[PDB]
Design a protein around this motif. Structure first.
Motif, PDB file in Angstrom:
ATOM      1  N   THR A 123     -20.030  -5.118  -0.329  1.00 25.59           N
ATOM      2  CA  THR A 123     -20.450  -5.911   0.815  1.00 25.59           C
ATOM      3  C   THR A 123     -19.254  -6.690   1.320  1.00 25.59           C
ATOM      4  O   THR A 123     -18.650  -7.446   0.558  1.00 25.59           O
ATOM      5  CB  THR A 123     -21.551  -6.886   0.421  1.00 25.59           C
ATOM      6  N   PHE A 124     -18.915  -6.518   2.593  1.00 27.67           N
ATOM      7  CA  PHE A 124     -17.930  -7.383   3.237  1.00 27.67           C
ATOM      8  C   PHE A 124     -18.709  -8.479   3.936  1.00 27.67           C
ATOM      9  O   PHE A 124     -19.273  -8.266   5.009  1.00 27.67           O
ATOM     10  CB  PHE A 124     -17.059  -6.596   4.209  1.00 27.67           C
ATOM     11  N   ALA A 125     -18.776  -9.649   3.303  1.00 25.78           N
ATOM     12  CA  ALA A 125     -19.522 -10.781   3.831  1.00 25.78           C
ATOM     13  C   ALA A 125     -18.588 -11.596   4.715  1.00 25.78           C
ATOM     14  O   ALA A 125     -17.688 -12.280   4.218  1.00 25.78           O
ATOM     15  CB  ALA A 125     -20.102 -11.614   2.688  1.00 25.78           C
ATOM     16  N   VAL A 126     -18.807 -11.523   6.028  1.00 25.92           N
ATOM     17  CA  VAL A 126     -17.911 -12.095   7.029  1.00 25.92           C
ATOM     18  C   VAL A 126     -18.741 -12.889   8.027  1.00 25.92           C
ATOM     19  O   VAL A 126     -19.037 -12.410   9.125  1.00 25.92           O
ATOM     20  CB  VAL A 126     -17.102 -11.001   7.755  1.00 25.92           C
ATOM     21  N   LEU A 127     -19.117 -14.103   7.665  1.00 15.29           N
ATOM     22  CA  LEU A 127     -19.867 -14.933   8.594  1.00 15.29           C
ATOM     23  C   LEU A 127     -18.983 -15.313   9.774  1.00 15.29           C
ATOM     24  O   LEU A 127     -17.876 -15.826   9.594  1.00 15.29           O
ATOM     25  CB  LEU A 127     -20.389 -16.179   7.891  1.00 15.29           C
ATOM     26  N   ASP A 128     -19.478 -15.060  10.983  1.00 17.62           N
ATOM     27  CA  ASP A 128     -18.677 -15.221  12.191  1.00 17.62           C
ATOM     28  C   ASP A 128     -19.629 -15.567  13.322  1.00 17.62           C
ATOM     29  O   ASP A 128     -20.393 -14.708  13.775  1.00 17.62           O
ATOM     30  CB  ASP A 128     -17.898 -13.941  12.484  1.00 17.62           C
ATOM     31  N   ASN A 129     -19.607 -16.822  13.759  1.00 18.98           N
ATOM     32  CA  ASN A 129     -20.460 -17.264  14.851  1.00 18.98           C
ATOM     33  C   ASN A 129     -19.659 -17.547  16.115  1.00 18.98           C
ATOM     34  O   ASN A 129     -20.210 -18.075  17.089  1.00 18.98           O
ATOM     35  CB  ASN A 129     -21.270 -18.486  14.413  1.00 18.98           C
ATOM     36  N   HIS A 130     -18.374 -17.201  16.114  1.00 23.51           N
ATOM     37  CA  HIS A 130     -17.565 -17.260  17.322  1.00 23.51           C
ATOM     38  C   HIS A 130     -18.167 -16.346  18.385  1.00 23.51           C
ATOM     39  O   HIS A 130     -18.684 -15.268  18.056  1.00 23.51           O
ATOM     40  CB  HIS A 130     -16.127 -16.849  16.994  1.00 23.51           C
ATOM     41  N   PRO A 131     -18.126 -16.737  19.664  1.00 30.43           N
ATOM     42  CA  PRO A 131     -18.842 -15.972  20.706  1.00 30.43           C
ATOM     43  C   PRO A 131     -18.596 -14.470  20.698  1.00 30.43           C
ATOM     44  O   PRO A 131     -19.548 -13.696  20.866  1.00 30.43           O
ATOM     45  CB  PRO A 131     -18.331 -16.614  22.001  1.00 30.43           C
ATOM     46  N   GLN A 132     -17.356 -14.031  20.513  1.00 28.72           N
ATOM     47  CA  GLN A 132     -17.035 -12.612  20.548  1.00 28.72           C
ATOM     48  C   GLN A 132     -16.984 -11.985  19.161  1.00 28.72           C
ATOM     49  O   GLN A 132     -16.621 -10.811  19.036  1.00 28.72           O
ATOM     50  CB  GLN A 132     -15.711 -12.402  21.280  1.00 28.72           C
ATOM     51  N   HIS A 133     -17.347 -12.738  18.122  1.00 29.69           N
ATOM     52  CA  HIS A 133     -17.353 -12.293  16.727  1.00 29.69           C
ATOM     53  C   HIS A 133     -16.103 -11.498  16.367  1.00 29.69           C
ATOM     54  O   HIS A 133     -16.214 -10.359  15.893  1.00 29.69           O
ATOM     55  CB  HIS A 133     -18.604 -11.458  16.456  1.00 29.69           C
ATOM     56  N   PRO A 134     -14.902 -12.049  16.571  1.00 30.80           N
ATOM     57  CA  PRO A 134     -13.695 -11.218  16.431  1.00 30.80           C
ATOM     58  C   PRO A 134     -13.367 -10.848  14.998  1.00 30.80           C
ATOM     59  O   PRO A 134     -12.773  -9.786  14.773  1.00 30.80           O
ATOM     60  CB  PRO A 134     -12.596 -12.095  17.045  1.00 30.80           C
ATOM     61  N   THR A 135     -13.707 -11.696  14.028  1.00 34.08           N
ATOM     62  CA  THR A 135     -13.394 -11.378  12.640  1.00 34.08           C
ATOM     63  C   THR A 135     -14.402 -10.384  12.091  1.00 34.08           C
ATOM     64  O   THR A 135     -14.027  -9.342  11.537  1.00 34.08           O
ATOM     65  CB  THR A 135     -13.365 -12.654  11.799  1.00 34.08           C
ATOM     66  N   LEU A 136     -15.685 -10.685  12.264  1.00 35.81           N
ATOM     67  CA  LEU A 136     -16.727  -9.741  11.887  1.00 35.81           C
ATOM     68  C   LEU A 136     -16.568  -8.429  12.634  1.00 35.81           C
ATOM     69  O   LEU A 136     -16.710  -7.355  12.043  1.00 35.81           O
ATOM     70  CB  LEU A 136     -18.098 -10.367  12.157  1.00 35.81           C
ATOM     71  N   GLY A 137     -16.248  -8.497  13.930  1.00 37.02           N
ATOM     72  CA  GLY A 137     -16.077  -7.279  14.703  1.00 37.02           C
ATOM     73  C   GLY A 137     -14.925  -6.429  14.205  1.00 37.02           C
ATOM     74  O   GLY A 137     -15.027  -5.202  14.156  1.00 37.02           O
ATOM     75  N   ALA A 138     -13.816  -7.070  13.815  1.00 36.20           N
ATOM     76  CA  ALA A 138     -12.678  -6.307  13.303  1.00 36.20           C
ATOM     77  C   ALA A 138     -13.044  -5.582  12.020  1.00 36.20           C
ATOM     78  O   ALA A 138     -12.662  -4.422  11.822  1.00 36.20           O
ATOM     79  CB  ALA A 138     -11.467  -7.218  13.074  1.00 36.20           C
ATOM     80  N   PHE A 139     -13.775  -6.252  11.129  1.00 37.38           N
ATOM     81  CA  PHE A 139     -14.183  -5.612   9.887  1.00 37.38           C
ATOM     82  C   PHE A 139     -15.146  -4.460  10.152  1.00 37.38           C
ATOM     83  O   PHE A 139     -15.001  -3.376   9.572  1.00 37.38           O
ATOM     84  CB  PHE A 139     -14.775  -6.664   8.942  1.00 37.38           C
ATOM     85  N   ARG A 140     -16.087  -4.646  11.078  1.00 47.04           N
ATOM     86  CA  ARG A 140     -17.033  -3.576  11.382  1.00 47.04           C
ATOM     87  C   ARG A 140     -16.336  -2.382  12.008  1.00 47.04           C
ATOM     88  O   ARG A 140     -16.635  -1.228  11.665  1.00 47.04           O
ATOM     89  CB  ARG A 140     -18.138  -4.096  12.297  1.00 47.04           C
ATOM     90  N   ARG A 141     -15.407  -2.629  12.935  1.00 41.99           N
ATOM     91  CA  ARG A 141     -14.708  -1.519  13.575  1.00 41.99           C
ATOM     92  C   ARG A 141     -13.862  -0.746  12.568  1.00 41.99           C
ATOM     93  O   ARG A 141     -13.854   0.494  12.573  1.00 41.99           O
ATOM     94  CB  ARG A 141     -13.843  -2.049  14.720  1.00 41.99           C
ATOM     95  N   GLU A 142     -13.147  -1.455  11.689  1.00 40.84           N
ATOM     96  CA  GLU A 142     -12.252  -0.795  10.743  1.00 40.84           C
ATOM     97  C   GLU A 142     -13.017  -0.049   9.660  1.00 40.84           C
ATOM     98  O   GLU A 142     -12.581   1.020   9.214  1.00 40.84           O
ATOM     99  CB  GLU A 142     -11.315  -1.810  10.087  1.00 40.84           C
ATOM    100  N   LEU A 143     -14.143  -0.600   9.205  1.00 43.96           N
ATOM    101  CA  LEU A 143     -14.846  -0.057   8.053  1.00 43.96           C
ATOM    102  C   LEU A 143     -16.023   0.823   8.436  1.00 43.96           C
ATOM    103  O   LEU A 143     -16.811   1.197   7.566  1.00 43.96           O
ATOM    104  CB  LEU A 143     -15.298  -1.205   7.145  1.00 43.96           C
ATOM    105  N   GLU A 144     -16.119   1.199   9.714  1.00 51.11           N
ATOM    106  CA  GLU A 144     -17.215   2.031  10.198  1.00 51.11           C
ATOM    107  C   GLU A 144     -17.437   3.263   9.326  1.00 51.11           C
ATOM    108  O   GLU A 144     -18.573   3.564   8.936  1.00 51.11           O
ATOM    109  CB  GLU A 144     -16.926   2.438  11.643  1.00 51.11           C
ATOM    110  N   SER A 145     -16.362   3.991   9.005  1.00 54.23           N
ATOM    111  CA  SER A 145     -16.529   5.260   8.300  1.00 54.23           C
ATOM    112  C   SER A 145     -17.033   5.062   6.875  1.00 54.23           C
ATOM    113  O   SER A 145     -17.691   5.954   6.328  1.00 54.23           O
ATOM    114  CB  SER A 145     -15.214   6.053   8.296  1.00 54.23           C
TER     115      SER A 145
END
Length: 244
Positions: free
Chosen positions: A218-240
């Protein structure tokens, strides 16, 4: 005499230091575990301990990565838990002594393993009716911001330092037969490591040396910033890795 508070002595006594010279033994433990499981991976918008509490009924061999200071045992996993009683154990002292004397913001490949640390409170700081025990791996990410400011010639060495220390985090987890890991944006924020690069570093290991070594990550990345840039980066990179 004093009341023995539950589990604290066993956690402190079972705390283990991993030193740089154990790198090869850790690599071997990870190599033996490679290919054991069809690993499930997820990237979640949760705190480290919220993820650990959610998973702890699913598994007992569950470990969380503490985004630790290298020099002193803005908030790490000591908040809300008994972790400080483990990090101050005498066997863990070289982690702090050696990192201090290194005088390098890349720090060293010392890690602390803390078994069955009680989580005392929830995200809001309220007491849990029953503490939830989790294993914790403490290792400092290289402080990219401090390297950039005070030893800029070390800045090209941040990425290989991060990868080699991430390799040792996974190696400690395999060495202690952990099946479930809670990872996250290690060294991001104050240490100023790039989230996509940290996610990509864990991806490289989990698709290679550590492929199938864990049941669940589990990559637990709480991110409430409007564009969710940290959570979004982890989701984009770890998609596969996250496809069910």
């Amino acid at each position: 005499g004093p009341v023995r508070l539950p589990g604290l002595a066993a956690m402190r006594q079972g705390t283990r230091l991993f030193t740089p010279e154990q790198g090869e033994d850790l690599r071997e433990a990870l190599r033996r575990r490679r290919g054991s499981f069809q690993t499930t991976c997820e990237v979640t918008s949760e705190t480290t301990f919220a993820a650990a509490r959610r998973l702890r009924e699913k598994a007992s061999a569950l470990a969380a990565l503490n985004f630790a200071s290298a020099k002193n045992p803005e908030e790490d996993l000591c908040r809300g838990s008994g972790l400080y009683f483990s990090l101050t154990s005498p066997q863990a002292e070289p982690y702090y002594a050696v990192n201090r004397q290194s005088h390098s913001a890349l720090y060293t490949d010392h890690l602390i393993y803390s078994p069955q640390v009680p989580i005392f409170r929830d995200d809001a700081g309220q007491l849990l009716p029953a503490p939830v025990p989790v294993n914790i791996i403490t290792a400092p990410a290289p402080n990219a911001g401090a390297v950039a400011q005070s030893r800029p010639e070390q800045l090209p060495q941040v990425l290989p330092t991060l990868r080699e220390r991430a390799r040792r985090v996974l190696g400690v987890a395999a060495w202690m037969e952990q099946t479930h890991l809670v990872l996250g944006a290690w060294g991001c924020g104050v240490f100023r490591n790039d989230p996509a690069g940290v996610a990509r570093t864990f991806r490289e290991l989990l698709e290679g040396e550590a492929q199938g070594a864990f049941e669940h990550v589990t990559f637990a990345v709480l991110d409430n910033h409007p564009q969710h840039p940290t959570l979004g980066a982890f989701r984009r990179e770890l998609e596969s890795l996250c496809l069910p």
